[PDB]
């Protein structure tokens, strides 16, 4: 079990860790989150009580170092930093626990939610979508735009998701125009799975990271990427059986976890009705279809 200490909490902020979150008051003696489950990526995120605009946060993995949060009064936000002095860090952490000023990562032992949401998400891949190679953790926020969004401005702040575009030369082989546009199997399996992602787990990893960014920050380009990666699978007649079965599980826990009140901006009516009811893979998302129907029959 790992710890992320906090130097202080000077501004009233709502703090999230993964799917959990806590209200902390201005200059409340909050000094970190302990018992964080090792072996998964994690995300710590923030929303100032004064600017319900701009949720922001940091993706990290404690195995990659000792990380802590510190408020910056110049830039006006809680910053993740790394402590390279291992001894100095255990000292701060042990003292704060002794003083019991830390919240416990509140995992129910029955609960595999976070695992199911992050099964294929690896820190190494996140740091290729959020390129900032002097930090071992990755910053994301509400406002950041994706590479594809920029194309249609500052590339240092870009989410370098894989560009998927159904009406591109990449998507469409010459002479198979109609075939490849109605049956994207080529694009999925040759171009994307074998070509760019190399295997299905990396594909699912990006899909999942995109969803969590949409969910935790309302990042609209991530929502677009998530729907695109779903649609690509669902619009392919030939998908490995192991990917279909895993996709239904992936989407299930994503739909289960979404706040009930946000279904309107986070769920694209067309893509879902197409995936669940029109696509080749209509019959392959039984769990995701059952929970979509019993929870958001309006969208359908």
């Amino acid at each position: 079990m790992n710890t992320v200490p906090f130097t202080s909490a000077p501004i009233e902020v709502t703090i999230g860790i993964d799917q959990y979150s806590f209200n902390v008051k201005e200059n409340q003696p909050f000094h970190g989150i302990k018992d964080i489950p090792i072996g998964h990526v994690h995300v710590i995120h923030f929303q100032h009580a004064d600017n319900s605009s701009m949720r922001y946060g940091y993706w990290f993995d404690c195995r990659m170092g000792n990380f802590y949060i510190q408020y910056d009064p110049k830039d006006g936000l809680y910053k993740m930093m790394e402590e390279r002095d291992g001894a100095k860090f255990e000292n701060i952490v042990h003292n704060f626990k002794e003083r019991q000023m830390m919240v416990s990562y509140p995992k129910i032992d029955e609960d595999d939610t976070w695992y199911n949401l992050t099964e294929f998400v690896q820190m190494d891949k996140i740091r290729k979508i959020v390129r900032k190679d002097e930090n071992q953790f990755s910053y994301v926020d509400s406002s950041m735009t994706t590479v594809q969004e920029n194309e249609l401005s500052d590339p240092a702040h870009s989410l370098n998701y894989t560009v998927i575009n159904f009406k591109s030369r990449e998507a469409i082989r010459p002479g198979h125009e109609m075939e490849d546009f109605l049956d994207k199997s080529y694009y999925l399996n040759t171009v994307m799975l074998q070509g760019i992602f190399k295997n299905s787990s990396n594909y699912f990893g990006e899909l999942q990271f995109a969803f969590l960014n949409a969910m935790f920050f309302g990042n609209y380009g991530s929502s677009l990427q998530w729907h695109a990666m779903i649609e690509l699978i669902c619009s392919s007649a030939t998908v490995p059986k192991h990917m279909l079965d895993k996709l239904d599980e992936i989407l299930y826990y994503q739909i289960k976890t979404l706040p009930e009140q946000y279904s309107d901006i986070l769920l694209n009516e067309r893509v879902w009705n197409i995936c669940l009811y029109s696509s080749f893979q209509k019959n392959s998302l039984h769990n995701t279809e059952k929970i979509m129907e019993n929870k958001y029959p309006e969208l359908l």
């Binding site: 591109s168 469409i172 125009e177 109609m178």
Partner: protein, 237 residues
Amino acid sequence: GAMNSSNYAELFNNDIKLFVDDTNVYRVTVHKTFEGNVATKAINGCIFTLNPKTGHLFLKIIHTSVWAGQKRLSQLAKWKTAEEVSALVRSLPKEEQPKQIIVTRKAMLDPLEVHMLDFPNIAIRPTELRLPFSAAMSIDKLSDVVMKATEPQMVLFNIYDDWLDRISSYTAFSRLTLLLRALKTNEESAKMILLSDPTITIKSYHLWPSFTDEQWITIESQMRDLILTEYGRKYNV
């Protein structure tokens, strides 16, 4: 963006553009089988691709052989149309390729867009106008060359005959669409009107009779009257 009454004069500027109409690409007769089931029999069709400024018509004849052994033919028709339009663009010298293609039905946007990916600077637009180009097979010479074809074939015409020697594109297009509108609403009358007078003939290299200017005024008014009459009948007004 879409084409409508506002931006209607853009059709007559000097940007090369073509209208594509696919309504007559996949044509069938519907009949009863011996067991009494319904079956279709395909007949030859055409793609109506027209430059509205110059009157040049690229009539791509769609021979029934194209369908043989194919499923979901009405969907395939859209892709074949897009395929043939793209090939037409590729066959034209660079300075003749259009800057825009306006499809008369929105179902053609994705097929054509996909077939034109090699031409990213050609814009594929829909339109809100309700153009009567389906009545193209009411023009006797067009229907004749489609129905007689024995193989895929492209036939070129000027759909304005020689009108542009005396009138503008705007007026030529308006005349064409009025003739076609009338042919669409009541073909028998429309054709009666055009041919009543046997002393006004159709040149071998033309589609429409060689009316004088005054006679075109009478004709156009007769076509107008036809169209309004049919409206009252359709709706009881």
